[PDB]
Design a binder for this molecule. Structure first.
Ligand SMILES: Nc1nc2c(ncn2[C@@H]2O[C@H](COP(=O)(O)OP(=O)(O)O)[C@@H](O)[C@H]2O)c(=O)[nH]1
Ligand SMILES: [Mg+2]
Length: 174
């Protein structure tokens, strides 16, 4: 059995989105697949059990990231969103509210419920931050995120584990 999940990686310019996809996709292991799959997204494939795999399409909002509003070809049929901000740039934090409001205005799961949304406070390795952890938690709750965590794509801190718990949630919602 194959479980296919389209995951949106959204957030303002310069927060670390392309770096997250480059680290977490399979592209540092093999890119042979791109010639027939294309490049709208990057893949990651994981064995899930003896008879099941999980396949993730990682969609980077990329060229339209500064518009803070997703287009239909980008968001359609997604199973989750990773909304990234830079802890050192409060504008990217504030704009995560606009990204989340846009997601919920555009997309639900097939059952009509909201898509899971994981808020990543990225660049946690830098100092000082422009927001506090208590501020992030209140913001995550007030805006209806599934949860939040700090990450450093640069130091590979919390990346794999944050994505892993999101996969497990997408499997539960399947
Ligand atoms: N210090 C630090 N730099 C990061 C981190 N993640 C990304 N960067 C850097 O931030 C810059 C922008 O990253 P990029 O992935 O292009 O951001 P995007 O514009 O959201 O795609 C690059 O120089 C990255 O190396 C992080 O966790 N910590
Ligand atoms: Mg980018």
């Amino acid at each position: 059995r194959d479980h296919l999940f389209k995951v949106l990686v959204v957030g303002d310019a310069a927060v670390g989105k392309t770096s997250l996809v480059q680290r977490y996709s399979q592209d540092s292991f093999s890119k042979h697949y791109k010639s027939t799959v294309g490049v709208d997204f990057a893949l990651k494939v994981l064995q899930w059990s003896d008879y099941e795999i999980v396949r993730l399409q990682l969609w980077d909002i990329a060229g339209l990231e500064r518009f803070t509003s997703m287009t239909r070809l980008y968001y359609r049929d997604a199973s989750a969103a990773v909304i990234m901000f830079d802890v050192t740039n409060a504008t990217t934090f504030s704009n995560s509210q606009r990204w989340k409001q846009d997601l919920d205005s555009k997309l639900t799961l097939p059952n009509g419920e909201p898509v899971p949304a994981l808020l990543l406070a990225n660049k946690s390795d830098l100092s000082p931050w422009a927001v506090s952890r208590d501020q992030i938690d209140r913001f995550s709750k007030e805006n209806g995120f599934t949860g939040w965590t700090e990450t450093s794509v640069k130091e590979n801190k919390n990346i794999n584990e944050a994505m892993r718990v999101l996969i497990e949630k997408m499997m539960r919602n399947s």
